[PDB]
């Protein structure tokens, strides 16, 4: 019990505070299990819109949306599923998503033909660097940490040079340039 719960709490919080970017629909799937866990099977009597504080069931970037109807619907989808069997599922849904176990940063990429930068999620692990869609969350690109030649940072930018001719560099708008530079560095020197 105690071990299963450490992981559940870990996965949960990393989602509620937005450390693990997930797409709406899933946040509500999670919330669904979160209700099964904290309340027990659904009760179409008590469990109706307004019966929940959505600030402690979802990523700040969805509390607004008001998908309280989505959560109870997913809640309902758990029948009489145990508090434990739900914790499990939630932890398997948390791992099945690529964004799982990555350390993102919000970056602003300049896309050709449009002066208007398009917010993006930058992901980094001890093995790769991925490009993740701000809203949808679906990765768009992926690079091996071992193909990183050098990086650079400034109080308002970050750039990664793989040494890939055609593509060139990957520069972005960021205030976290010195932290994203620190991470990678730590990782790289662990991986020869």
């Amino acid at each position: 019990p105690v071990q299963l719960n450490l992981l559940y709490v870990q996965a949960r919080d990393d989602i509620l505070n937005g450390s693990h970017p997930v797409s709406f629909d899933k946040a509500c799937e999670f919330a669904g299990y979160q209700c099964q866990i904290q309340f027990g099977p659904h009760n179409e009597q008590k469990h109706k819109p307004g019966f929940l504080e959505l600030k402690d069931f979802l990523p700040k970037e969805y509390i607004k949306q008001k998908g309280e109807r989505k959560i109870f619907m997913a809640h309902k989808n758990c029948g009489n599923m145990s508090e434990i069997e739900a914790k499990v599922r939630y932890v398997k849904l948390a791992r099945s998503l690529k964004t799982y176990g990555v350390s993102f940063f919000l970056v602003k990429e300049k896309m050709k033909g449009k002066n208007k930068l398009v917010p993006r999620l930058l992901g980094i692990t001890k093995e790769c660097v991925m490009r993740v869609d701000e809203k949808t969350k679906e990765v768009i690109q992926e690079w091996s940490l071992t193909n990183i030649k050098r990086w650079a940072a400034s109080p308002k930018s970050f750039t990664l040079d793989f040494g890939d001719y055609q593509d060139g560099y990957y520069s972005v708008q960021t205030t976290e340039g010195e932290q994203i530079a620190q991470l990678i560095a730590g990782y790289i020197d662990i991986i020869l």
């Binding site: 193909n147 990183i148 030649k149 790289i188």
Partner: peptide, 13 residues
Amino acid sequence: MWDTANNPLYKEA
């Protein structure tokens, strides 16, 4: 402003 990985793919090894 560069910080290289001194990665064997590039650095002369």
